[PDB]
Amino acid sequence: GAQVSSQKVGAHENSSTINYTTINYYRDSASNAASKQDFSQDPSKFTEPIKDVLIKTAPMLN
Amino acid sequence: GAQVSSQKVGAHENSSTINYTTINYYRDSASNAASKQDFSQDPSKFTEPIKDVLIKTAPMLN
Amino acid sequence: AATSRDALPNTEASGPTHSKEIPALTAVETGATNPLVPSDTVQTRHVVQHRSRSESSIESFFARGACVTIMTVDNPASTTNKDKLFAVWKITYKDTVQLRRKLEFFTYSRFDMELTFVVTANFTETNNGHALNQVYQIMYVPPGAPVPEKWDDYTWQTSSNPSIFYTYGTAPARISVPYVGISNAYSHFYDGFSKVPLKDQSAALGDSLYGAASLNDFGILAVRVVNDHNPTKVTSKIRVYLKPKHIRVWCPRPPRAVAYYGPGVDYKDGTLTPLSTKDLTTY
Amino acid sequence: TNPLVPSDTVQTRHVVQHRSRSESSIESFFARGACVTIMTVDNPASTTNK
Amino acid sequence: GSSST
Amino acid sequence: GSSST
Amino acid sequence: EACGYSDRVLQLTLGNSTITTQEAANSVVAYGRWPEYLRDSEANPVDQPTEPDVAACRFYTLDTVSWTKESRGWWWKLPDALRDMGLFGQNMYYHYLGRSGYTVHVQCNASKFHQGALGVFAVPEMCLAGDSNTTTMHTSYQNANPGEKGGTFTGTFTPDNNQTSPARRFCPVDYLLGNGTLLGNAFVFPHQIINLRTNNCATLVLPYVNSLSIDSMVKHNNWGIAILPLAPLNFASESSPEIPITLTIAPMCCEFNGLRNITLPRLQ
Amino acid sequence: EACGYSDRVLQLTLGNSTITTQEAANSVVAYGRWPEYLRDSEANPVDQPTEPDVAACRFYTLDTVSWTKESRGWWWKLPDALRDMGLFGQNMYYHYLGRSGYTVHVQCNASKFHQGALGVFAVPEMCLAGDSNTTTMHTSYQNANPGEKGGTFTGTFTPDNNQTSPARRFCPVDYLLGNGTLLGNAFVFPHQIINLRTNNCATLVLPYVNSLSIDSMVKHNNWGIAILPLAPLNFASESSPEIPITLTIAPMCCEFNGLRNITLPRLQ
Amino acid sequence: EACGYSDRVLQLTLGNSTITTQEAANSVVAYGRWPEYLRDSEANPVDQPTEPDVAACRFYTLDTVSWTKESRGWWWKLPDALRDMGLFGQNMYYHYLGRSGYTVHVQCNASKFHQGALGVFAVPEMCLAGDS
Amino acid sequence: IDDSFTEGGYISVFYQTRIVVPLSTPREMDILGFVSACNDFSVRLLRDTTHIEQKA
């Protein structure tokens, strides 16, 4: 049941992907650590909530 | 001898089944943890212990 | 498919322009923010971007244990006229300001909770006696259950309530809690009441606090020293650290700009002027 | 006991149920350490009469 | 080896 | 066994 | 469109009501979510819902307010503003539970020689601050719920000192959005600006937002409408100009559960 | 059914309401027509109808009346009897037009030692006769529409002689069905009989009947419920026996057109 | 049944005894388990058992009690109530060990003008409280 | 627990018509009431009860 994932390697030694291993010891998900394998979304629902889609090169009002 | 099972995942991270691993270290079953992989049964032996099977839409007495 | 730790967009090279396309002009009345990048208004070179928004992800922003309360308990001599002090704390993130402000960037949230307990003790009197190592009981009392009245009454049996027995001097205690809300998300703000004042009914009867939902939401932590009274009195404090893990948040809000005044959005006279003097034409 | 559900006596909508009886299983109900006794022992001076 | 479930 | 990622 | 169509000219029709506008600045759909009915997968009360459709999901016009150089701002809460509005209100008070989305249309016309800009904000859970420095969370239900009439913002926090007969009302200071946060950041909330040189109106389509799929509309307001002058009204040279602001709101996709006898609230 | 089912035992469920009966005498569907919504082919107002469904199509129980040896009979008009009944009444008064069918359930239990038979009649257009021998067609709207309370029949026509302040009300003589026709023939109308040795109740399902597809429910009643003792109440040897009659009615397939402000009638 | 059968009318026959009833409210099988003999897989004493069959598995009628407005309730224990009942009792007292299931039939008729409701309960291990 | 935020409502019983007896019959009688849960019922967050205790 081991989970193996990639580390995003910052400062490299003078020493190819580096991995780390994770095993969950408990039945309840709440006991689990934070994965940090998170997603990003587009800001549109906040930055552009207008009914008619905007084209930046075009006049906002027309 | 490792046992691997699914966690019923409640609150999800912004991050597919999640598993956990179990290994028994002792010869005696009494030493084992609680699996919590339990079953449910129908309440009938308590709620409906009557010899003649009841149909809820029909008159209980006839 | 965009990961938090993915690099941001590259800057593309941009040349001169003499066009009917007008990116710089817009109308904020619409409610939208103009999605411009430097190449829209200036000549740019090609840059291969390596920066990432990994540390500003909602997990990462909250992935730290914050102090939410300090509990005081003690273990006095048997002969004293004052009762042995056990502590009772109603669980909340609102007794301290720092984590509260970070959570209040959002209207609603869902998360699993990690609680870490740091326990310290000291001698109270300029005495010379001593005490043996203390064990602490941290009992969670959910709304409904019997709250302890005495450091040693029957409630501390904990047949059904979760309890931690902490040995002084060992690594700080830690547990996890699931999302336990009776709603689909925790409400950081509740613009309402828990009661409807009915015409027919007494004014006093339909009254409730503004913004307050369940009069007891999550119960309390009750803490005590399990050791019997020593001749030398020892006082102990339990600091509680809360970390929201596996967190999700909804509906962004402006941060608190004036000092907090209680559990609600109320502000106190005299704390309302956050901004400093700076002149319009002064760098 | 009459095995009725709301749709037998009132007009109902379709609800997709997500609740579970996981925490009221016999294991789960008892899966907690309860205090059953308190024992007292001591270690006195050699010289005491008790 | 691994008894899965 | 090993769930890789 | 080459055949004449424009972002400034709109027609909205709900039930037996139609709104036209020739000077709009597009319209906002809050958080990009159009109103919807409660899905079976997210459902919670098991009884057959009441869905009034055209009888309630139509445009109700609330009392017109007046914008002047002294005006600090105005606020309304939803569903509260609509509690006495025809069959929407009736359905609201006969059921324990209800949910609803809204189309909010703010109306303010003036002339090519006037100036001023109104910020129109839709706030989820708009908890406002009270008038007391001795007790907290103590605003009475009556004061918290002005109905159609709404409430106003103030430029100055002035604490209720009557400890024996407390006023028990809000004291919403405008630059602090009446809740302790700075107004310049209120733009993270769904909004539009009525800038008189650009547009006569603001139109906001609001989804039902809550931490629950359905709730008590009588105990709880889901949205707050806050209208504040970002730039003060001005005209030609007149020391005391005035122009009206009319608010028209339509419930959308509203459904109700838990039918019983009508709730008769103590509103005074 | 060999597995127990019977014509005497019924369960009716509409909205959040259920009626049970263990002593029924089957049930009547008037003119063999079950209630239906207005079809597009027969439609006339073009606006989207309001259809309240479970909020109005449910069982409303009107005030219980009392049957005695002096009782000549009782009458009700529909929709009038239901005008103050919850959301049905509200929808009725907010719209110019409305149509509706009904399930009528008359309730009267007694004991194996009582006797008596109630004739329960559903009359389309039950125009009743007035109290005047000097003027005709002159019963006031207030008197013609008793609401929930209903009206009663009399064994004797007694003319209003007050020519200066006329009573302007009905004077419905029982053997003439209050309209000039003989009661023994009222059985050509949809009906049931509550004969106390046989049944505790009567159940009539009524279609919308009219010469129009939809009409003004406030100006016009479509059905009249008339309950008369065909055989007088009797018990053991008691000179003055009494047993209650309870009336429960449900609107069915009701729809409303022409929404505007609420009608506030002069009912006194 | 269309050919007359009903939940109210029953006939029970055990050994040389038959009970009839025309006003029953069905019958209860406790915990859904009908009585059975001890299986070899669950057996424990190794000696050949005595099984009296019809000589003991028959209907014994105990003394009739009287229900009045003062009546608070009645209780019995099994096998104790049957200890002096014919060959069941004899077999019970000659052997160290014994097991048995039971059909309990409580009888109480009155008239269409009487009222009252008796709760009849079968309790496993009915330990009662003492007077001290 | 009793809490207005999670209040469940009101159960009430009424006479629709009335109880009718003949002569020689008791004019007063009892009804008994029972409660149980439907199959969609669940409970969570195990806690200690206030319905039993041990002073000393």
Ligand SMILES: CCOC(=O)c1ccc(OCCCCC2CCN(c3ccc(C)nn3)CC2)cc1
């Ligand atoms: C009133 C404002 O604050 C909140 O809305 C709010 C919302 C969520 C927050 O989470 C609290 C949830 C509490 C759940 C409790 C359940 C279990 N807990 C335990 C369990 C065992 C032990 C030994 N100690 N504590 C402690 C936490 C805290 C506050």
Ligand SMILES: *C(=O)CCCCCCCCCCCCC
């Ligand atoms: C999947 O996990 C199969 C391989 C397991 C490798 C050894 C795991 C190390 C010990 C974990 C013990 C279980 C934790 C309760």
Ligand SMILES: *C(=O)CCCCCCCCCCCCC
């Ligand atoms: C099945 O278990 C085969 C794989 C074993 C993996 C390593 C186990 C971790 C160490 C357990 C030691 C034994 C406990 C007494």
